[PDB]
Amino acid sequence: EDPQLLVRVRGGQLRGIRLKAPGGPVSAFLGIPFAEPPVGSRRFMPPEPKRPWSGVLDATTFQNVCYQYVDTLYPGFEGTEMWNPNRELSEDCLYLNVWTPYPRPASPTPVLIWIYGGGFYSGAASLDVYDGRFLAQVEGAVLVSMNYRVGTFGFLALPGSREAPGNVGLLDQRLALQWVQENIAAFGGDPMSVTLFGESAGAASVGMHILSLPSRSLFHRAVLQSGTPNGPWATVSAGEARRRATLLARLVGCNDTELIACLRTRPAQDLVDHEWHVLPQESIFRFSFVPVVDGDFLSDTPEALINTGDFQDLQVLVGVVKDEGSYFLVYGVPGFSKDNESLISRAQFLAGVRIGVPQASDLAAEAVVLHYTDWLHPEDPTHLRDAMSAVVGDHNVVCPVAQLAGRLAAQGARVYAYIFEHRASTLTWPLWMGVPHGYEIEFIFGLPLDPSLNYTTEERIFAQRLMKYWTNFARTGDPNDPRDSKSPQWPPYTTAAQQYVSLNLKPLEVRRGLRAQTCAFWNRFLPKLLSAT
Amino acid sequence: EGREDPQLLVRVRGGQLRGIRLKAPGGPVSAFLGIPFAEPPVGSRRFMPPEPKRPWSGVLDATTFQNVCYQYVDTLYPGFEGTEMWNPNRELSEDCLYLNVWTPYPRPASPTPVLIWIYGGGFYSGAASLDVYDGRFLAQVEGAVLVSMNYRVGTFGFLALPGSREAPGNVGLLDQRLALQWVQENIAAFGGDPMSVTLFGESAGAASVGMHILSLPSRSLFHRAVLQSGTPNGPWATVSAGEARRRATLLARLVGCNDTELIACLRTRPAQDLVDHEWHVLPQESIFRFSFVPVVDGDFLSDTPEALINTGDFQDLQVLVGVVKDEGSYFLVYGVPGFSKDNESLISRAQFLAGVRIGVPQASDLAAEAVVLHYTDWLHPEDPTHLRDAMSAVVGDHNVVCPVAQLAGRLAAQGARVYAYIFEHRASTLTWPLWMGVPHGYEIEFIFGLPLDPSLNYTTEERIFAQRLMKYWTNFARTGDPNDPRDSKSPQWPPYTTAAQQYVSLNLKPLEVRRGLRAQTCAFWNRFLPKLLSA
Ligand SMILES: NC(=O)c1cc[n+](COC[n+]2ccc(/C=N/O)cc2/C=N/O)cc1
Ligand SMILES: NC(=O)c1cc[n+](COC[n+]2ccc(/C=N/O)cc2/C=N/O)cc1
């Protein structure tokens, strides 16, 4: 019984495991329950605080992954499987992981809370890419990551109902955030320096925590990697949630109470089986059960909330990868594949766009097509493929990010923006996907520091830079290294200057305007188009 | 006859002409100026198609320019050269259907390719007698037979009650056509080769050239066309029959006037009254919109220029088209608040949004917002210099660059041999401010080789450049190809193609080949904007 690996949290005692990171040990407390297993009648329900336990809870092992669709598009492909649950699926999955330095830090340490992505339909805090050991070891970070319920389990909302209020996956996260507040000190986490970070749906979750009052007291800073609460995919209206919940109910043979009661009776996988059949359109980058504008967790739409919010005492790191959109093309856009070069035809581009912008009228879609077509090379398939990617990325991540960045900056938030452009040497996706959604995580998390992983030493150094930025950001709300000078400085993203840095192997390069023209199209014109059909 | 210069006496179908031996820098040219090609479209012939000039007796003196067609005289900057050079430089009269011929002197031995200039002036102004249209240089240096005609502008040329007999529309185009007919029959008398007739015109003249390309009966009258900064397609070069009707009847009301009764009344109105009200009939506050312009009558223009360029076969056709660096700047000073020649015209976002409404007067709120969204530099959305230049770009793009783009594209896609340029050289002599860059119409003096007149204060590179441009134009006139056939030492001007979209820069530097005529931005105007108006 290593006394460093033994912690009394509020619910009782935990025994962590001493994990080794390349530069020394780290105390990992994995699988800490932060809620009553949201099983049985607790399905679709807000998480209840975990009841205290007797003895020493073994917290040396990752707990189950929240029940979710396992991707099957390319079975056994590292590029997909690395996101697949790497633990048993269970609805009993409300667990969080805490990595701290070994020994437990002397003074309260900034806490980073990771919220995984997975389109609100998947993910697990246990995936290798979210291994917090590196940030814990190299940076002395207390790194927390929770599981939260995904898909129907996390986000089936019958808005207004008691039994499926929606947003429970976010409430899960909130609970983990509460758990951190009440408990992290026991690990030498500073509950007064908690930085959320997350990517993609995790970023959106972070943004939703930013935009939800009861969440705001549970952290001080946020990082949104490649995802925003605003935007086309991260939220649905109450009505749309109801529609999909209802549709799923039909699809599985099921007032809200009786509908939900029936849904409660359904084997987890049945819900998952029919989860995708509730999308109004053939889509990419769209997900059936996502946070719901419920008037409750989200008092208004994220757009509304980022327009009106006061974000004075908020610091935010946001950014995108170079190819936000490439990843998604292979999952429903004809002509795209990890296997060929996905050189697509004009027609496949126009059709691809209807799938990428499923909410688009013909005119909006034409607007998009006409905007993204390089008219010097209108039918060149490389351009069209890259444009399809661009469309999907801009529409879904880049422009939502720019919007968020701008709105937060305009409304007092200190904002740092980045574009991550380094394509992992070890990346199993084809070159044309460039730097896909999610492939910065391994770097932020510091996996290149694990020599056994085959990352180049330029990458190891890069990961170190990024872990420095992230944790400096966590420590201080400023990602710049004070123990460094002018190599060069990461400026706050402002609405005037619109500065952001490229994160890649070269030093920070400050760029201005995060696809400013194109985002103007998406953020300013596109809504005007559709808001007049 | 007998005591005078034997090389200035020419007979044409209507009779005997005495021209004038004019001094060009490199030697003399023959000019036959103010040759009537139509019956004065006066009195009862106002608004009527031109009738062929009835033969005259004796030797018609063709030694001076004739009347300029009755027109509005721009008075925004009185005494300012930049506006005065466009201003009529001969008496304003409805009796104005006269053309001009410059030929080498002595007249060319063998049939020489004919250049016919059609001046612009927004269809409400212009005159073949402006100094910038002086054919002497192209005649002297290039051996070209240059012909320019006056055609009726404004109401007299374009007021239309479509369907009516008495104001069928497009008569100013018909004057041009009549002058083309004149060149066909008579140009050989000057050593002109009626089988090598190139039209060229700038701005409304270019639209006019385009109209002729688009109009069957004109087709047999020329072989090649140059469209400088103007196109028959685009938002200003034509009006629907309905809109022409609307403006004609409104103009009528404005001056106190069944089509016959209306026209008859209009015919009793003094020219100046018509001119005085000409500009009050535009549907919106606007720039680069002109009240009386060619009408889609289903006669001269069998359908919209858009429709005819989209579906015509342009096999036999060589077209040189192009734009100036800054097509839009000129028009900004005449009715976009904020803009002036007298200052840097740094405007505000408000003034830009306002400008866009004036610059794209046909635009719905949504379409205007698109324009604004497109042209705003979102890094510097409030930046007055960018906004000022974006305003210019909006007007230039919308009215010239993108119409030219659609035109070049559609023409190339349909068999035409298209050569495309952007003229980027700002005359060292330009009296407009620097921000205006190279405004609309300021390539003309170079095409015409004015810089060759040593007394005109152009620089030597400008003289050389004029010569190059004159070469391009006359080569294109000769061969359908602006390139010098021997001289491959100079870079080649490739045809504009839909595939490669090549055009050249015309500036002091040797031909640089560029790709895509604002391809991205013209996709907005030519492909997106129409759709944004179909709802
Ligand atoms: N719940 C379901 O049955 C289900 C869920 C998700 N998909 C598609 O998910 C594939 N996938 C997997 C991973 C990513 C994100 N990568 O960064 C994106 C995507 C899709 N984008 O449209 C199909 C069925
Ligand atoms: N009734 C008309 O069509 C009309 C009459 C007079 N103007 C005076 O316009 C000023 N102006 C005068 C000269 C030029 C071009 N000169 O080369 C361009 C412009 C701009 N027009 O919007 C315009 C339309």
Q: How far apart are CA A287 and CA A201, in angstroms?
A: 10
Ligand 1 midpoint to CA A432 (Å): 19
Closest CA relative to residue B229, chosen from B260, B205, B253: B205
Which helix (H) or strand (E) covers residue B102, if one does? Answer: strand B98-104
**If you compute the radius of gyration of chain A from its CA atoms, what whole number of angstroms results?**
22
- Residue B374: C-alpha distances to residues A281, B102, B163, B397 (Å): 29, 46, 40, 12
- Strands B502-506, B512-515: pairing kind: antiparallel
Both tokens of residue B56? 């005259």
Q: How far apart are CA B272 and CA B288, in angstroms?
A: 22
In single-letter form, the type of residue at position A14 comes to L
The CB of B122 under 6 Å from ligand 2? The reply is yes
Are the beta carbons of A23 and A103 closer than 8 angstroms? no
For residue B129, what is the DSSP state?
T
Asked if B535 and A498 come within 8 Å (Cβ–Cβ), the reply is: no
Q: Is residue A533 less than 8 Å (CB to CB) from chain B?
A: yes
Residue B440 annotated to the active site: yes
Asked if B377 and A529 come within 8 Å (Cβ–Cβ), the reply is: no
| Domain annotation for chain A: domains and CATH numbers | 1-533 (3.40.50.1820)
Q: How far apart are CA B388 and CA B398, in angstroms?
A: 15
Count of all residues that appear for chain A in the document: 533
Q: How far apart are CA A182 and CA A215, in angstroms?
A: 14
- Strands A509-512, A414-420: pairing kind: unpaired
Chain B residue with minimum CA distance to A498: B379
DSSP string, B263-312: HHHHHHS-HHHHHHHHGGG-SSS-SS--SS--EE-SSSSSS-HHHHHHH-
Both tokens of residue A218? 């549970």
Q: How far apart are CA B406 and CA B427, in angstroms?
A: 28
For residue A532, which residues of chain B lie inside 8 Å, CB to CB? Answer: 366
Q: How far apart are CA A132 and CA A447, in angstroms?
A: 9
What is the distance in angstroms between the CA of the first residue and the CA of the last residue of chain A?
66
Cis omega before residue B168 (within 30°)?
no
Distance from CA of A512 to the nearest CA of B (A): 7
Asked if A366 and B516 come within 8 Å (Cβ–Cβ), the reply is: no
DSSP string, A108-174: -EEEEEEE--STTT---TTSGGG-THHHHHHH--EEEEE----HHHHH-B-TT-SS-BS-HHHHHHH
Q: In what order do the strands lie in the sheet with A499-503?
A: A17-21, A24-33, A95-101, A142-146, A109-115, A189-199, A221-225, A315-321, A414-420, A499-503, A509-512
For residue A520, which residues of chain B lie inside 8 Å, CB to CB? Answer: 373, 376, 378
- Where helices occur in A315-398 by DSSP H, the ranges are 326-329, 346-356, 362-372, 381-393
* Mutation pick for ligand 2 pocket among B76, B124, B281, B431 (CB with most ligand atoms within 8 Å): B124
Chain B residue with minimum CA distance to A362: B531
Closest CA relative to residue B366, chosen from A468, A204, A278, A531: A531
The CB of A155 under 6 Å from ligand 1? The reply is no
The CB of B288 under 6 Å from ligand 2? The reply is yes
Closest-CA residue, ligand 2 atom 8, reads: B74
For residue A524, which residues of chain B lie inside 8 Å, CB to CB? Answer: 373
Q: How far apart are CA B518 and CA B498, in angstroms?
A: 13
Are the beta carbons of B183 and B221 closer than 8 angstroms? yes
Paired residues of B226 in beta bridges: B200, B320
For residue B63, what is the DSSP state?
B
Neighbour count for residue A190 (Cβ, 10 Å): 18
Instruction: Please work out, in degrees rounded to the nearest 5, the angle formed at the alpha carbon of residue B515 by the alpha carbons of B509 and B518.
Output: 100
Closest-CA residue, ligand 1 atom 24, reads: A276
Asked if A498 and B370 come within 8 Å (Cβ–Cβ), the reply is: no
What resolution in angstrom units was achieved for this structure?
2.6
The CB of B202 under 6 Å from ligand 2? The reply is no
Torsion of CA A18, A19, A21, A27, to 10 degrees: -50
In single-letter form, the type of residue at position A136 comes to A
Chain A residue with minimum CA distance to B532: A363
For residue B535, which residues of chain A lie inside 8 Å, CB to CB? Answer: 363, 533
Helix axes B241-255, B271-278, angle to 10 degrees: 120
Q: How far apart are CA B238 and CA B122, in angstroms?
A: 11
For residue B515, which residues of chain A lie inside 8 Å, CB to CB? Answer: 376
The CB of A272 under 6 Å from ligand 1? The reply is yes
Both tokens of residue A330? 């292979």
**Ligand 2 atom closest to Cα of B278?**
1
Unique residue bearing structure tokens 């400013």: A516
- Strands B192-202, A509-512: pairing kind: unpaired
* Mutation pick for ligand 1 pocket among A328, A357, A429, A440 (CB with most ligand atoms within 8 Å): A328
For residue B101, what is the DSSP state?
E
Are the beta carbons of B467 and B452 closer than 8 angstroms? yes
Asked if B378 and A520 come within 8 Å (Cβ–Cβ), the reply is: yes
- CB contact set of B86 (below 8 Å; sequence gap of 6+): B74, B121, B125, B126, B130, B441
Q: How far apart are CA A135 and CA A124, in angstroms?
A: 18
Name the active-site residue from B94, B327, B424, B445.
Answer: B327
Distance from CA of B348 to the nearest CA of A (A): 16
Helix axes A238-251, A256-264, angle to 10 degrees: 50
> How far is C-alpha B128 from the chain's CA centre?
11
The CB of A328 under 6 Å from ligand 1? The reply is yes
Are the beta carbons of B204 and B230 closer than 8 angstroms? yes
What is the distance in angstroms between the CA of the first residue and the CA of the last residue of chain B?
69
Closest partner residue to B373 (CB to CB) among A376, A498, A524 is A524
Closest-CA residue, ligand 1 atom 4, reads: A276
- CB contact set of B330 (below 8 Å; sequence gap of 6+): B432, B436, B439, B440, B441
How many H-runs (helices) and E-runs (strands) does chain A carry? 19, 18
Asked if B535 and A373 come within 8 Å (Cβ–Cβ), the reply is: no
Q: How many CB pairs under 8 A join A and B?
A: 49
Q: In what order do the strands lie in the sheet with B59-61?
A: B9-12, B15-18, B59-61
Task: Please state the φ and ψ torsions of residue B490, each to the nearest 5 degrees.
Answer: -75, 140
Cis omega before residue B106 (within 30°)?
yes
Q: How far apart are CA B393 and CA A328, in angstroms?
A: 37
Asked if B379 and A498 come within 8 Å (Cβ–Cβ), the reply is: yes
Chain A residue with minimum CA distance to B381: A496
- Active centre residues of A (catalytic): 200, 324, 437
Which helix (H) or strand (E) covers residue A223, if one does? Answer: strand A221-225
Q: How far apart are CA A410 and CA A416, in angstroms?
A: 13
Q: Is A35 left (phi over 0), alpha (psi -120 to 50) or beta?
A: beta
- Residue B439: C-alpha distances to residues B126, B169, B330, B395, B450 (Å): 17, 30, 5, 11, 17
Closest-CA residue, ligand 1 atom 2, reads: A276
For residue B408, which residues of chain A lie inside 8 Å, CB to CB? Answer: none
Q: How far apart are CA A312 and CA B150, in angstroms?
A: 69
Q: How far apart are CA A315 and CA A478, in angstroms?
A: 8
In single-letter form, the type of residue at position A104 comes to R
Ligand 1 midpoint to CA A71 (Å): 7
Paired residues of A157 in beta bridges: A165
Method: X-ray
Paired residues of A318 in beta bridges: A224, A417
Closest partner residue to B369 (CB to CB) among A516, A528, A533 is A528
Asked if B378 and A516 come within 8 Å (Cβ–Cβ), the reply is: yes
Q: Is residue A106 less than 8 Å (CB to CB) from chain B?
A: no
Unique residue bearing structure tokens 């309905």: B242
For residue A366, which residues of chain B lie inside 8 Å, CB to CB? Answer: 528, 531
Instruction: List the 475-514 stretch of A: residues with Cβ below 8 A of B.
Output: 498, 512-513
Both tokens of residue A284? 């990419």
Paired residues of A509 in beta bridges: A502
Residue B203 annotated to the active site: yes
DSSP string, B409-450: HHHHTTT-EEEEEEE-PPPTT--S-GGG-SBTT-SHHHHTTG
The CB of A275 under 6 Å from ligand 1? The reply is yes
Are the beta carbons of B66 and B96 closer than 8 angstroms? yes
Which helix (H) or strand (E) covers residue A95, if one does? Answer: strand A95-101
Both tokens of residue B183? 């060149």
SS (H, E, C) B194-236: EEEEEEEEECHHHHHHHHHHHCHHHHCCCCEEEEECCCCCCCC
3 state DSSP class of A357: coil
Torsion of CA A227, A233, A236, A242, to 10 degrees: -130
* Ligand closest to the CA atom of residue A82: 1
User: B92-112 burial string, b = 16+ CB within 10 Å, else e?
Assistant: bbbbbbbbbbbbbbebbeebb
Q: How far apart are CA B60 and CA B37, in angstroms?
A: 12
Are the beta carbons of B103 and B29 closer than 8 angstroms? yes
